[model samples]
Target: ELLKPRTLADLIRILHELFAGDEVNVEEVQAVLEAYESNPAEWALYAKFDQYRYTRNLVDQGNGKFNLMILCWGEGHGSSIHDHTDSHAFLKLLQGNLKETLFDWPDKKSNEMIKKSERTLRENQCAYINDSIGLHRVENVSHTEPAVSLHLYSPPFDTCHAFDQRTGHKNKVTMTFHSKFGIRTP
Candidate 1:
C-alpha cells in the first residue's frame, strides 16, 4: 500500500470528477474545498505576486467546466468590488490574511450599491458566494506581506462587471490569466 498526501494534481482530478455531471452540486464542491489543508510547500510555488496588482494564474481549466486559479495578492492589494456574473465563486485562502467585503446589488431603479457586511479569511478557510449573494471585493489586508488564495469559478465566465463601492457605476471586463499551465503570459 502506498500512502501519500494529496497535491495540486489530485485536487484538479477530484474537481474534474465533481463537475463531470450535468447538474453540479454546490455542497459537493464546497465540501471539497473546505476539506483541503494548506500545503505551502506545493502551493507556495504558484504563489507569485505582481507588485502592481494581484495576479491570477491558471491551475486547472476543469475542461472548460470550471476554472481553478491561484490568485496571488500583493500587500494592500484588492480587487474591485464585482459580481461573479453567472458563476459560483469559491475561494480558499492558502497563506496570509484576506478580507472580503460584500455589497448589495444595485436596483433597476437606481445605479447605487449599498454596503452589506464583511468577513476576513485566515489560512485554510474557504468561502463561497455568487451574484445572487451580491458583489464582493477581496483584499490582502497586509501592508507588507503577500497572500495567496485558490479560486474556483464554475461555469467559467468570460466577462464580469466591476462596480463602484456606492456609485453603481460599473464596467464590463474580460478576465485573463497571468499564466497558463505555469507559463507566464506576455
Candidate 2:
C-alpha cells in the first residue's frame, strides 16, 4: 500500500520535490499523486459546468513552474484531444470514475491522431501524460454522478494545441479557469 499524506499541504511538498529537479519524471509524479487522495475540505467548491466548464485552478505558482487544479466532470463532459506543450502533467481521480483515451500521430507534422488505447481510472487512481505521448481526451464514466480529479502540471502551461480527429485541423487554445482560491476578479 502507498503512504497517504496527512493533508493537502503535505501533498504539495511531495509534488514539489518531484518537479524541482532538472528533469521531471511523469511516472514518479503520477505515483506520488495517486498515493494521496484529496477531500472537499482541501478546496472550496464554486465549480459550475455552465460557467467554467467544470475546471478550477487551485494553485498557480509564480515563475510559471507548477500549479494544481480541481476538475469536475459531469455526465457526458470531457476535454478535446490535445497536447500539453512540453510540460509534465498527471491527473488523480479523487471521486467517481474517469475514462482516458490516448492517441498517436503517424507523422510529426500531421494533424491526424491514430487511436492508441484507453484506460479507466477509479478513485485514488492516477494517470500521466506528456508531449512525447502525443494526444489524449478524458471523460466522466458515470451518467448519474459527477467526477472530480486533481491535476498537476509542471512548468505550468498557458497555451496548447487541440486537434481535430477527422478534419485534420489544429486549434491553439488559451486555458481558462472557473475560480481561484484567492478571489475572482470581475
Candidate 3:
C-alpha cells in the first residue's frame, strides 16, 4: 500500500517498521522511498547545501535502529571512494542527478583500485551499496544545478573509511552530522 500523502514523516514511520530487525531487504526499502519525493516543507529542513561540500543532515534516528538522512550536494560535489563498513546504505535521489562510480576492492599486495562500473541516478531512483559490493563514490555531476539525496543506514554507523583512489590507503573517519532533528549541529 502507498503511504498517505507520500510525506517524509510517513516514509520514516514505514522505514522504522521495516527496520525493526537486524536485517532490511533492499527491495522493501526501495519501494518505500520510491513512493516518496522531496517536500520542501519537510525535506528542506533537513537539506542544507554547502558550497564547498555535500551536507549530511539527519532527519530521524529510527529508535536507534537506523538513520534517515538528507545529503545535499553543491555543483561538482561528490564523495571519495568509501565503504559502508558494517551497515547497509541506501540512496534515493530527491533532486537533480547523481553519478555513482563503483570501484573494485583494492588488492592488499598492490593496493590498486579499479573502477568497475558507473551509472547516473535520476530523481526518484533508489540505489543500494555496501562493503560487500566494494567501495564506491557518488557525485553531483551537474555543474549548475544542485542535488539532494536521501540516505538510510541500518543499525547506524559511526565511522567509515575514505580510500585513496591511487593507493587504496583507507583513512578511517568518524561520521558527523551537519544537522539533527531539524536543528543544526555544533
Candidate 4:
C-alpha cells in the first residue's frame, strides 16, 4: 500500500472533495487525516522515508485546506523548533514514542525563532494546534527506538521557520522540493 497520490490531479481532486465549499468539516478532515496516517502505502510512497530518518510529500489540497506529511524517526532522531505560517496543524503518533514540544513565537516574523510558548507530546499522543498559540518543536526522545508521526497542515503549510534553540538565528524552510521531507544538517 504505497500512497503514490494516484496523480497530482488525483491528489488535487481528493483535496477539493475534502476542503472545498463554504464550510469546513473537522470530521471529514479527521477522516482524511486518519486515512493518510493509517495508509501503509504512505510510509514508502512518501519521499523522506529511508533506513534512518525521513518524511512525506507536501501535497496541495486546494482552497486553504491542509497539506500532509509523514515522518519516520530512527533512534535518537528529532526535528527543529519551528512553526507554520499561522496555520492549524495536527499530529498523530503512529508508532513508538515521540517527544514533541511546542513553543510560542512572539515575533511578527513567521520565520523568527523566538521562544515564548510551549507544550509537549509523549508516545501515542495526538494534538491540535492553531497559529494564535502554536509554536513548538518535536523529537524522538527514545534513545534506542524508532518512531513515526503524521503531520497535517491546514491552510496548506508551505513556509515554516526552523530554529536552533542553542542559537538565536532562524531560517525560512519551504516545501518546494520533495527533499524537504527529512534533511539532517549541521
Number of the top TM-score candidate: 3
Error of 3 at 148 (Å): 0.5
Model 4 per-residue lDDT tens digits across residues 85-121:
7776777666776765766654444354455544555
The local distance difference test score of each candidate is 0.83, 0.73, 0.86, 0.59
Q: Give the runs in model 2 whose Cα sits over 4 Å from its true position.
A: 1-3, 46-52, 60-64, 106-112
lDDT by residue for model 2 (97-133), tens: 8999998744646455667999898998988888788
TM-score of 3: 0.94
TM-score of each candidate? 0.92, 0.85, 0.94, 0.62
Candidates 2 and 3: which is better by lDDT?
A: 3
Judged by TM-score relative to the true structure, which candidate is superior, 1 or 3? Answer: 3
Residue 19 CA error for candidate 3 (Å)? Answer: 1.1
Clashes of each: 0, 0, 0, 10
Q: Best lDDT goes to which candidate?
A: 3
Candidate closer to the true structure by lDDT (higher is better), 2 or 4: 2
The order of the candidates by lDDT, greatest first, is 3, 1, 2, 4
- Alpha-carbon runs more than 4 Å astray in model 4: 1-18, 22-44, 47-53, 58-64, 107-125, 164-169, 176-186
Candidate 1's displacement at residue 104, Å, is 1.0
Error of 1 at 143 (Å): 1.4
lDDT of 3 by residue, 1-186 (tens): 445337888888888778877777778788778878667677878888767999999988887878889999999999999999778899999889999999987778556788899999999888998889888999998989999999998879979999998798889988889899879897
Clashing residue pairs in candidate 1, if any? Answer: none
TM-score of 2: 0.85
The superposed Cα distance between candidate 1 and the true structure at residue 8, in angstroms, equals: 2.1
